[PDB]
TrEMBL record, chain B:
PROSITE patterns: SHMT. (6S)-5,6,7,8-tetrahydrofolate binds at L120, G124, H125, L126, S353, P354, F355. This is Serine hydroxymethyltransferase. Belongs to the SHMT family.
């Protein structure tokens, strides 16, 4: 008898909904740029008895008895993180990217200090100073955005904003930014104004780890990330720093500063994900992720769609829909009708509200994990274009549904589960 | 081929360590009061593909596409939590008890406001105002403690402290308090001074759910909890309230106020655990948890040990070593030497450093889940007392080891789990 058997027997309601989610993942193009398909080995750790252990503290320095094997696992996670990112220090306990960022704020700032991040509507994250988040509620948040002429960062402009605002912390790393970030220029800016510098590399962490994006670790005071976007791990957070003394302060801000017990089953999954990312295959995967995103962006452009900034150098893109006279909300609905899963997103300088938007955010990591290549991503672009150009045409609709089904059949997902 | 097979094949290092942890859980008396053994069904949800879904927002009100099935699961979790605790609102997204508490603080307080909680050394939690936690760093946290005479709360004294300090938020619910909490009296106190009232029922949530401890939901502005202590769920948090308008504000403080994406695999596990807690067997389990803790406390007292407050009304106890020639750190080590897992713990009025302590915290939930009864808990007390009374005696040590092994063999843990 298996744990899944017990679930079916004791809670058929939840068992059936979970099986429907597996089928959903199998039968949609999962183009949400922040999603991935984590490995069977990672899922095994998350389904383990490690959930039962209280392990407040750090390896060998715990507030609870019984942590001998949890300590071995968490130290492997730390050591593999330091290896994978070339970092002198790593804390693998943050529950999420948001909680990683907050522990950094607790270390470096006090309430009322000034933080500078990218405007939420230009691709910054809610935890980088949004009024609805603690970062904008308890701190003075100021913003920079992208240039209207390029739709990407203008570093001289960022320097001028920094000089005018004199923030205590500058944040770089974003949620919808398709170009390479120059961490050396951010360090030059931070040094000129005397600010701390955080890189939140959540989206791009797998590309950083594999050498397909510049590395912030030697340049920034601290690097935070999720483990679950391009890094393809379990859902959670991570704090890295080049300064090992500062890293000890970040440890104290994770626990007891902001969290209680760590999720040790998730931390075992982090160890597994970092081990996978250290293999040559992960570098090839990350290169394919970028090639696939570029193939999709280019074919969307061939079909008449505007890509914000004119292309991408990473795994994601924003489609600016003002051309096909659709909002992002409308386009997201229209692609969902043909079994394509994405999310709407404001574009820089968007005339629509954040509840409507002019953009659709698409990314390649999840379908690249399923094995799709560049020609398959050009086919995805053509399905999207066909649907959005002919939203009333039922025969185009069915052709799109069928072409999605063919892609899903060609590239099975977790075929050993509930076959 | 299973996910566990993939783990053994691709990461034998982690696979082996994880196996060792299963064996460790099987072969020790797990007396950590805040631990439990969650069910196979809960573990199945946590090991599922639900980890792949981004689901910021709320059911039917998401910022990501594709949430149709996640929305059904999270709404089942919400609905079962509301039924289980009699709450008008529930948010099942907090990643932990600490994060549930922080979302409450973000809703009710601004930095610099005054909060009042139990002193850490008297069993309050770090998130209730410790200066090492955001709660005491960015808020002015004042404290109350237990009576020196009874070693439990004196509600008239708490009232006097509240009248003098005029806190904006009073926090009740604790990490090492063995007696029933009177939430009606805490409400009377909060009302006298105009404070909000939070109950953090992390430790006792399963006893509340089963009717074996008074329910704070009708009396407090908000109730937070962990899902993984006496509630026996996956590791995570939960916010409950009697006031649905406050509930809407707590939702916004969880997301986008405090967190990003929720852990929907864990939330499916919360749904499963709440469904288990709604069944009559859970009520019987919770009554056994208390009877077992009481039996262990009573037999420790029969052996000459002191229990803070003179006994327990719930699942936990502190052995008070202030008058014994061992520290809490040593007592924890000595029981670990005979395969008993606990934690050292500060006692009220402890003369010792928090790195040393004069207490040992013990609880019944995890071994009650394995099937032990009151006579078995009396036996646990006698094993502990034998070891602590004779710390250097090697024959007693080996007898203790054998007696622990006998209990572990008689009451197996997850017997269906094999090696890959
Ligand atoms: Na502000
Ligand atoms: Na002592």
């Amino acid at each position: 008898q298996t744990n899944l058997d017990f679930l079916l027997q004791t809670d058929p309601t939840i068992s059936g909904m979970m099986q429907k989610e597996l089928q959903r993942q199998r039968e949609h193009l999962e183009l949400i740029a922040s999603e991935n398909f984590t490995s069977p080995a990672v899922m095994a750790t998350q389904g383990s008895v490690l959930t039962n252990k209280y392990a407040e503290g750090l390896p060998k320095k715990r507030y609870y008895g019984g942590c001998e094997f949890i300590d071995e696992i968490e130290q492997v996670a730390i050591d593999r993180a330091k290896e994978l990112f070339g970092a002198a220090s790593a804390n693998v306990q943050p529950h999420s990217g948001a909680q990683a960022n907050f522990a950094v704020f607790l270390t470096l700032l006090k309430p009322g200090d000034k933080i500078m991040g990218m405007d939420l509507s230009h691709g910054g994250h809610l935890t980088h100073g949004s009024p609805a988040n603690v970062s904008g509620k308890w701190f003075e948040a100021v913003h920079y955005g992208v240039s209207q002429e390029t739709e990407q960062l203008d570093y001289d402009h960022i320097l001028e904003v920094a000089r005018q605002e004199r923030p205590k912390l500058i944040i770089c790393g974003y949620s919808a930014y398709p170009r390479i970030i120059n961490f050396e220029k951010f360090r030059a800016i931070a040094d000129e104004v005397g600010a701390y510098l955080l890189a939140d590399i959540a989206h791009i962490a797998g590309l950083v780890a594999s050498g397909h994006h510049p590395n912030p670790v030697p340049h920034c005071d601290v690097v935070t990330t999720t483990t679950h976007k391009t890094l393809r791990g379990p859902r959670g957070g991570l704090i890295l720093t080049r300064d090992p003394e500062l890293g000890k302060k970040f440890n104290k801000s994770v626990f007891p500063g902001t969290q209680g017990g760590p999720l040790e089953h998730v931390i075992a999954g982090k160890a597994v994900a970092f081990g996978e990312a250290l293999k040559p295959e992960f570098k090839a995967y990350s290169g394919q992720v970028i090639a696939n995103a570029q193939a999709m962006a280019q074919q969307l452009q061939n079909r008449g769609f505007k890509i914000v900034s004119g292309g991408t150098d990473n795994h994601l893109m924003l489609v600016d829909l003002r051309s096909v006279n659709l909002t992002g909300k409308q386009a997201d609905q229209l692609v969902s009708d043909v079994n394509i899963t994405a999310n709407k997103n404001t574009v820089p300088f968007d005339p629509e509200s954040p509840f409507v938007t002019s953009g659709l955010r698409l990314g390649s990591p999840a379908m690249t994990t399923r094995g799709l290549g560049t020609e398959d991503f050009a086919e995805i672009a053509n399905i999207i274009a066909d649907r959005l150009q002919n939203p009333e045409d039922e025969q185009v609709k069915q052709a799109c549904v069928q072409r999605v089904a063919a892609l899903c059949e060609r590239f099975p997902l977790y075929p050993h589960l509930n076959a």
